[PDB]
Write a protein that binds this ligand. Structure first.
Ligand SMILES: O=C(c1ccc2c(c1)OCO2)N1CCCCCC1
Ligand SMILES: O=C(c1ccc2c(c1)OCO2)N1CCCCCC1
Lengths: 304, 304
């Protein structure tokens, strides 16, 4: 029993992290097969970042201008290309520790583990969610760019995120591994404001199921609701609208606990309207939204 | 910027996890050099657990009764001994992935990463604290026994915890790697109640510094206090007493932020007395106590 914010074991990804230096900028790269993936802003000075023309900056760069170091050994760069906002540096050596992997573009609400790295060396691992405004709330200092987000299905690492920047509000923006930003963000030092950081309703419900399963049941009430009635309250409290697709996804947790999804929605509705009154759920004083239904099932069943 | 509950990268420990089976009980072992460490209750049936005589149960066990599997390969057990509440199974093969390591017995308040494992396979990694009542609040299903807690200093893994049991209240108890329980707990299925789970005051203060550093400053007040005045409030709110040793440990965070430790104590005192009034600090509605001063400095400076 118990329920923890839990990251995937990071070993498979640790094996992929390298240091990329271009001139005086050092950040992290991901080494998969004979390709190192890194943020294209590695070619920028702090000056360049104000209005970079990446294609023009890249003309001034050759293979030998990108220094790739894996541990204390240098990799030979035999090719480089820019795909959207990432650089792909072809090296002469396949990463011998390349795990089974996929590049996936996740949806808002989806959770993933981040291996925070500095100079190509892992510092820590944490769990986070793609926010509905396509930011993430990370822990990233200077040098952490190119740190990656991932899920694991048994032995296959799905890479979903590469860290590129911090907004003036101290939230995080980055790309998938094809170099496409999540949301409307760009790798430029400009006014970029995030939209409304709404609560991931389906994730809250999942976590309320996790709570019931782990014996925290005080918030279960005597009411039910409908998707339309619930959504009116959701809207008011900056919760994401709940769809039938979310209800379907919650089916197994409904089945396990014998609490109909709309009943749990009615318990959530009362929690929003009445607050937690100084109570906690799974040791939280607010409604946790960075566990997916899949995360709850995984942790409650003990998938490895 | 940003501040996350962050575990150590788990790869070094992933390399140490094995499956231990004795008869019909399967749990996890830690394989370091040519020794596999596991909970001695691996020799117990669910029946035995009510009043096990471990020395008597062990007489009925030979080297060949302990099945040790690392991936899909069996290890040959050439010796076994019981040290306190752990078994040490000598195998004929040194773990080739043995990291630099130490066994350390941590104090209450100290944080560590847990690699949750099932059948010797890692499921996830999370951060937790040795509670002042020598429990931890983990996420452990059946088969997770022998999962370990650890800190990393650069390349040296300090093993501090091995998971042994869940109390009837769903909190966790385990040993150091010499098999000595944290607190008064025993590997027997009996009435074992935890004492008061007090708040780790020094850790709250550290996390308030982390908050100020990351721009969350609304709770900073116009007051200071003394250790004796603060402690009277601490006592009342089931916070651990703050010592000069804790004040000294907070010195670097005091220095960095320019907020005297006793001033932050006075801000904490007001938060206890006045509550958070629906406000959050670092996205928490309660005062987080599972970051040490060392953790805050590490994450705020970006140690790898
Ligand atoms: O809802 C509660 C409440 C009840 C029990 C609790 C709790 C809160 O937190 C821990 O256990 N209150 C508090 C007392 C006044 C009545 C209305 C609001
Ligand atoms: O202390 C607060 C408060 C103020 C601002 C906040 C907040 C809480 O949470 C988000 O921003 N209140 C709420 C209003 C009535 C006055 C006393 C209690």
């Amino acid at each position: 029993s118990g329920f923890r914010k839990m990251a995937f074991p990071s070993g498979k990804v640790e094996g992929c992290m390298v240091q990329v230096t271009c001139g005086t900028t050092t950040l992290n790269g991901l080494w998969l097969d004979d390709v190192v993936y890194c943020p294209r802003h590695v070619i920028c000075t702090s000056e360049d970042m104000l209005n970079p023309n990446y294609e023009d900056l890249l003309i001034r760069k050759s293979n030998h201008n990108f220094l790739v170091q894996a541990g204390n050994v240098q990799l030979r760069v035999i090719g480089h290309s820019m795909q959207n906002c990432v650089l792909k540096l072809k090296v002469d050596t396949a990463n011998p520790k390349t795990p089974k992997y996929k590049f996936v573009r996740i949806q808002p609400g989806q959770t993933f583990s981040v291996l925070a790295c500095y100079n190509g060396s892992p510092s820590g691992v944490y769990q986070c969610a793609m926010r509905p405004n396509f930011t993430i709330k990370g822990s990233f200092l200077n040098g952490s760019c190119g740190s990656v987000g991932f899920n694991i299905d048994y032995d296959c690492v799905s890479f979903c995120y590469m860290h590129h920047m911090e907004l003036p509000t101290g939230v995080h923006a980055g790309t998938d591994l094809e170099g496409n930003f999540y949301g409307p963000f760009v790798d430029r030092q400009t006014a970029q404001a995030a939209g409304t950081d709404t609560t991931i309703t389906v994730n809250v419900l999942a976590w309320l199921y996790a709570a019931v399963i782990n014996g925290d049941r005080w918030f279960l009430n005597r009411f039910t609701t409908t998707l339309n009635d619930f959504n009116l309250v959701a809207m008011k409290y900056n919760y994401e609208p709940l769809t039938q697709d979310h209800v379907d996804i919650l089916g197994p947790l409904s089945a396990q606990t014998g609490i109909a999804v709309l009943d749990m929605c009615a318990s959530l509705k009362e929690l929003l309207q009445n607050g937690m009154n100084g109570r906690t759920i799974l040791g939280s004083a607010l409604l946790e939204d960075e566990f997916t239904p899949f995360d709850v099932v995984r942790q409650c069943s003990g998938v490895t």
